[PDB]
Design a protein around this ligand. Structure first.
Ligand SMILES: Cc1cc2nc3c(=O)[nH]c(=O)nc-3n(C[C@H](O)[C@H](O)[C@H](O)COP(=O)(O)OP(=O)(O)OC[C@H]3O[C@@H](n4cnc5c(N)ncnc54)[C@H](O)[C@@H]3O)c2cc1C
Ligand SMILES: Cc1cc2nc3c(=O)[nH]c(=O)nc-3n(C[C@H](O)[C@H](O)[C@H](O)COP(=O)(O)OP(=O)(O)OC[C@H]3O[C@@H](n4cnc5c(N)ncnc54)[C@H](O)[C@@H]3O)c2cc1C
Lengths: 490, 490
């Protein structure tokens, strides 16, 4: 603990989000980032519903939306006529925010710094040891190698995670069989169809202004340096007729569908988040979404463990909750690849039937919820009998009515990163019962009718419901949940 | 017309069904069959809900069920845990009848003969000409070649249809890329897993008694003579470990997924039915079902045309109605092939999600209806405004209450192969209005509440609703439908 409470390995968007969260939880966070200067990415990032809702309860949503384009729908597996309908899901943010990942990275960096996280760029982690008392990290710095001692170390260091490998955590999954190229390059052609198309030999996504010039190319066919020539050639194989790509080249890269996940998100004092914990083909823009939400899930649990009121069991719920979520993201990207397989004989007809189905609200809601994260709910600390219908559900989008009729968004209340007891129906017995926890937990009265009904919601710092009360609920049950979740009464 | 009213080319199950129907319509039917003796097939035929319902209204269902096994469900695209649920569909025959096609062929032959159809075996059709007055067929018979003159010729002569080719009707579609082998052979192995399995290299379906001996093998990998050695080898490639197949061999055959459909089901005095009209991979046992229903659709329309009260327009509704149906069967078999593709990287995960979906009633009902034929309804002779919700729907499964409370299955009423006017709510105005059509159309009073509501149903000889009356319906509307469908009043 000598150097800092928590060392974050990697200053990508996920590490920076995690450091923000740790600071909001009142503990020290040191971010060791390998690069001296951020690289640049695909400039077409997407932040989906549940990520947007999460940013809102952190008070970050506004700056993320400054000068931002949004989308009110999304195609599924390259199917556009019957796309994902954001209106069928319960949310007050029915849109995807189109924010370039580099901007997301800059914003989170600014925030993390403003919150008192120390960021060190050009410090690469080369070694990692842990014992009962603490974690030591070996870093390549200014006078060469030095050691950092901390209570916990979190690897948010990407798919090629150093932390994961050195902690001895397995990364089971498949190897890539799909090869994709993506580039932002200029072109001498006009009225070029800005279409997403399947052909017999692959997938082509051309995005060029009708005048010609800088545009986005993505080509997919069923690591290493990419040239403007490779891109040009691949486009030809897939499209049939060659396309003239020329400089200036703003970006050239490759990626594949290797689908892997850390077997454990936690090993003693070491934990993983983001791509360090899971990799997959970037279909439907789900990767960073998952990672940012990994971080908000872990941040307050980790801060609570450091300060002494979070239990080991609590910290264990990080893996138990987030691992199933990423496992499903991996499966769905792989399934989408099957649906997009370039293949007129069988897959084209199969796509016809899927499209019909997407025209129905129930199935459409099914996939919308899957891609946008709105279907994420947790099953933590259940009885032991059955738990309340609201337990584990997301409450960050609820809006109460205050003493004088004015709205009270639960999102704005959670901005302090403290648990909330929402008293939806009176229940002064409950509010009184929570007082010995007043230092950790906030009590807030407000009228609201939810579905299914609830008289009270004990809400976690990440917007999910830890505990829900029915009329049958006794103050004693709440004291039990308060202890189990948030530690012993003062 | 000199030789017979209608010549049927081919004495497979579809030609024999059609000849039955033509006889029930009171016109002459001559069946020219190439083979001198029926060959043998896969002995695991399946007759699905809508075929079973059709057999019932023909009074054939009983003999088809004599000593017959039935199934109360079916897997979809090799998915068994969440199979097609027959209970979610509206029917009083929620089962598949497992009848070997050879038995179906024998029964229809017996029936066709008992009904006065002449069957000629070992007479192959070699030539076909038509003019305004009639159709001439050239046949290879006892004293060699002879000519048959008829008003209409129907090609029910299989996928390699002579009639289709000689009539100049195109057969657009795909060529086969999937190669399957199927055989009934004995084996020296015991406790052999009677499982349907996907592997990395194909699909294997083993069905052997735990003692060993005669069993069914199907192997699928993504024409010509098959040997016990070919079978044995293919099984090895797909399964990994070789399997000992030995004589006696009861059957050995191959098939593929060539997916083709006649562009026209009718060319003047020549029409097509069954495999002559459509071919596809035999996944989900839909081929003969479609063909038998093609025949019941055409039989009474064709008989009515010959006798003078069926219009050309009516006869045209054969193609208009049945062509869309087979087109969808082709698409769904091709789509199912995509779902079964042996492929762990993408298709396995995709199958997981489809399986979840099949666990929902709505989606399950969707596929059940597709495979069993229960979703078939027609859109014929519509306004011109909107048509009654019951128009085009299948009414063969309705059961009325008679004068004294006793049930009156609509299936038993249709057994005469005459149109029915069902008076569900009184409407003596309607019954009186139908009297000038009494020679073609039967009137039957009986109480029943249907959903959506209907006061009267004008029902076709194949069990589908030609016309439905609301309270607003006038006798004049019915006279109009009666004329358009069933010809001028007497
Ligand atoms: C083409 C493409 C498009 C995508 N589009 C989307 C999208 O639209 N929406 C979405 O949600 N996701 C998208 N993704 C996925 C998304 O980019 C990733 O999930 C995201 O980058 C994960 O962020 P991260 O911080 O976990 O890892 P990274 O961004 O990889 O950051 C890890 C950081 O750790 C540092 N590091 C590594 N090793 C060490 C070390 N030993 N010591 C110190 N530092 C180290 C690296 O320098 C890096 O800065 C896309 C991916 C691709 C390839
Ligand atoms: C392995 C397998 C399993 C199947 N399982 C099912 C199933 O479970 N359920 C289902 O509904 N379908 C199934 N099918 C499909 C089904 O068998 C066919 O759709 C069915 O045989 C079509 O019958 P048909 O009478 O139209 O054609 P056919 O059975 O091919 O009969 C055509 C007849 O025409 C004769 N003929 C051809 N040319 C001439 C000529 N020039 N002159 C005179 N006669 C001629 C032939 O001798 C033949 O008897 C399966 C198919 C296969 C391959």
């Amino acid at each position: 603990a000598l150097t800092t409470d928590v060392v974050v390995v990697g200053g990508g968007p996920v590490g920076l989000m995690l450091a923000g969260e740790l600071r909001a939880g009142g503990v020290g966070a040191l971010v060791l980032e390998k690069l001296v200067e951020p690289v640049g990415h695909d400039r077409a990032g997407a932040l989906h519903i549940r990520t947007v809702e999460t940013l809102d309860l952190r008070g970050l949503l506004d700056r993320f939306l400054e000068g931002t384009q949004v989308a009110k729908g999304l195609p599924f597996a390259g199917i556009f006529t019957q796309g994902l309908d954001f209106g069928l899901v319960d949310t007050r943010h029915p849109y995807t925010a189109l924010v370039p990942q580099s901007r997301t990275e800059a914003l989170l960096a600014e925030h993390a710094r403003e919150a008192g996280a120390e960021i060190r760029r050009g410090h690469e982690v080369t070694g990692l040891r842990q014992d009962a008392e603490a974690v030591e990290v070996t870093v390549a710095g200014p006078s060469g190698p030095y050691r950092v001692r901390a209570r916990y170390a979190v690897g948010c260091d990407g798919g090629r995670s150093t932390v994961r490998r050195l902690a001895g955590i397995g990364f089971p999954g498949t190897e890539a069989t799909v090869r994709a190229l993506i580039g932002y390059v200029t072109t001498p052609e006009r009225e070029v169809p800005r279409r997403w198309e399947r052909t017999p030999d692959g997938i082509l996504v051309l995005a060029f202004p009708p005048e010609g010039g800088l545009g986005r190319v993505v080509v997919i066919e069923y690591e290493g340096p990419v040239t403007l020539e490779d891109l040009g050639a691949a486009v030809a194989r897939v499209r049939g007729t060659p396309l003239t790509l020329t400089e200036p080249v703003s970006w050239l890269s490759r990626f594949g569908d290797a689908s892997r996940q850390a077997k454990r998100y936690r090993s003693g004092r070491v934990l993983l988040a983001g791509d360090a914990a899971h990799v997959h083909f970037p279909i439907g823009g789900q990767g960073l979404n998952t990672g940012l939400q990994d971080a908000v899930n872990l941040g307050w649990k980790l801060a609570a463990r450091v300060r002494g009121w979070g239990s080991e069991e609590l910290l264990d719920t990080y893996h138990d909750e987030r691992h199933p979520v990423a496992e499903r993201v991996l499966l769905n990207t792989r399934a989408q690849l099957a649906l997009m397989r370039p293949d007129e004989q069988h897959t084209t007809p199969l796509r016809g039937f899927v499209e019909e189905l997407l025209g129905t609200d129930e199935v459409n809601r099914y996939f919308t919820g899957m891609i946008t994260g709105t279907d994420v709910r947790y099953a933590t600390f259940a009885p032991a009998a059955r738990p309340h219908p609201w337990a584990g559900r997301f409450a960050g989008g609820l809006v109460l009515s205050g003493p004088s009729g004015e709205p009270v968004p639960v999102a704005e209340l959670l901005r302090s990163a403290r648990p909330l007891l929402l008293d939806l129906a009176g229940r002064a017995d409950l509010r009184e019962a929570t007082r010995p926890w007043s230092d950790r937990v906030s009590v807030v009265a407000g009228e609201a009718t939810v579905e299914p009904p609830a008289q009270a919601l004990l809400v976690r710092p990440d917007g999910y419901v830890a505990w829900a009360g029915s009329p049958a609920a006794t103050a004693d049950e709440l004291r039990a949940s308060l202890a189990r979740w948030f530690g012993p009464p003062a």
